Structure to design on (316 residues):
């Protein structure tokens, strides 16, 4: 299968990208350089990751070296929760553009549906430890995202961590100008997301699967938690196909018509993770992997469960 998926803005998005959350700033420049050298054409970024300057150094060097042309890259970033105010969206986008050393983004996402009080802190707290919300809703933030398209700063806009009712809310927005192109959500064999994926795809919204390997480097990992990479059933499917477990975990969402964004800063794994276009999981393999769902989340935004727009109380 094909390397890119067509978005509802008419542009094509590479189905494999490199994730950068937790990629240390002293390692991510080489990670992105290696990724581009071995074929990656999509990098998933965010201001909250604090490493966009270093990602940008790599992008700029590979453009300067003429390893790739800008039109061949698909660079994604995300608007942090403390910038949901309509007067802050442009500046947030522009800071990301300046750090990534880009004149446009291919895709800019609302990182979470939850808006927080603006300020220096990414998670502003009250004296009791609750995250302080913003009163700006998802629809006014969306209008501000639409303006970025109309100013040439971004080619596509989308959402991330939106539940089905929140997707619907955008789709039903009075005066909607641009539909979301993408909803980026956690998705892997333990969180298969069957209901939300079907909804989004039925509406022409492409889904990107994050944490496809189960984010073994997440900072809140516990010994007892389920581990995709170590799951012998998944290992068995990998062995049958003469591939690694990670390669199965990456190919899985691809065959669901998803985009997938595994993260690594290890050169060998960056290359490994890209060598997924030369085998096929059977339908039986796909059904089997889907059967491992247990509604287990890496990213539950646990500090924000009272926020009015917290996404994960809703079944989907
Ligand atoms: N929109 C959102 O809210 C959101 C949330 C979470 C994630 N994301 C995006 O999705 C990306 C991927 O998710 P993630 O970073 O949570 O986790 P992930 O991609 O599921 O897993 C990354 C971890 O797996 C390791 N790894 C990578 N390839 C491997 C391989 N072939 N064999 C063994 N281990 C391997 C990495 O180690 P090394 O790096 O040490 O090689 C790292 O510890 C993020 O980086 C970010 O770009 C977005
Ligand atoms: N939630 C986050 O995005 C960061 C990630 C991380 N920060 C980072 O650079 N790598 C990481 O895993 C981190 C590391 C920690 F030890 C504790 C919290 C924490 O939170």
């Amino acid at each position: 299968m094909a390397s890119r998926i067509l978005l509802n803005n008419g542009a094509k998005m590479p189905i494999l990208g490199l994730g950068t959350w937790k990629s240390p700033p002293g390692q991510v420049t080489e990670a992105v350089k290696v990724a581009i050298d071995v074929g990656y054409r999509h990098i998933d970024c965010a201001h909250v990751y604090q490493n966009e300057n270093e990602v940008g150094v790599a992008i700029q060097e590979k453009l300067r070296e003429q390893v790739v042309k800008r039109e061949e890259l698909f660079i994604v970033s995300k608007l942090w929760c403390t910038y949901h105010e309509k007067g802050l969206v442009k500046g947030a986008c522009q800071k990301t553009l300046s750090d990534l050393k880009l004149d446009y983004l291919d895709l800019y996402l609302i990182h979470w549906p939850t808006g927080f009080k603006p300020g220096k802190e990414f998670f502003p707290l009250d004296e009791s430890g609750n995250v302080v919300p913003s009163d700006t809703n998802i629809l006014d933030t969306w209008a501000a995202m639409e303006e970025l398209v109309d100013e040439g700063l971004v080619k596509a806009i989308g959402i991330s961590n939106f539940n089905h009712l929140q997707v619907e809310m955008i789709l039903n927005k009075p005066g909607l100008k641009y539909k979301p192109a993408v909803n980026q959500i956690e998705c892997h064999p333990y969180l298969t997301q069957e209901k939300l994926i079907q909804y989004c795809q039925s509406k022409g919204i492409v889904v990107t699967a994050y944490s496809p390997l189960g984010s073994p480097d997440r900072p809140w990992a516990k010994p007892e938690d389920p581990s995709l990479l170590e799951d012998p059933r998944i290992k068995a499917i990998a062995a049958k196909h003469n591939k690694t477990t990670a390669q199965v975990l990456i190919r899985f969402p691809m065959q669901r018509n998803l985009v997938v964004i595994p993260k690594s800063v290890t050169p060998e794994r960056i290359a490994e993770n890209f060598k997924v276009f030369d085998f096929e999981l059977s339908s039986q393999d796909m059904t089997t992997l889907l059967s491992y769902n247990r509604n287990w989340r890496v990213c539950a935004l646990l500090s924000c469960t009272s926020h009015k727009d917290y996404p994960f109380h809703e079944e989907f």
The longest helix spans residues 86-100. The pocket of FIS (ligand 2) is lined by residues 22, 217, 219 (CB under 6 Å).
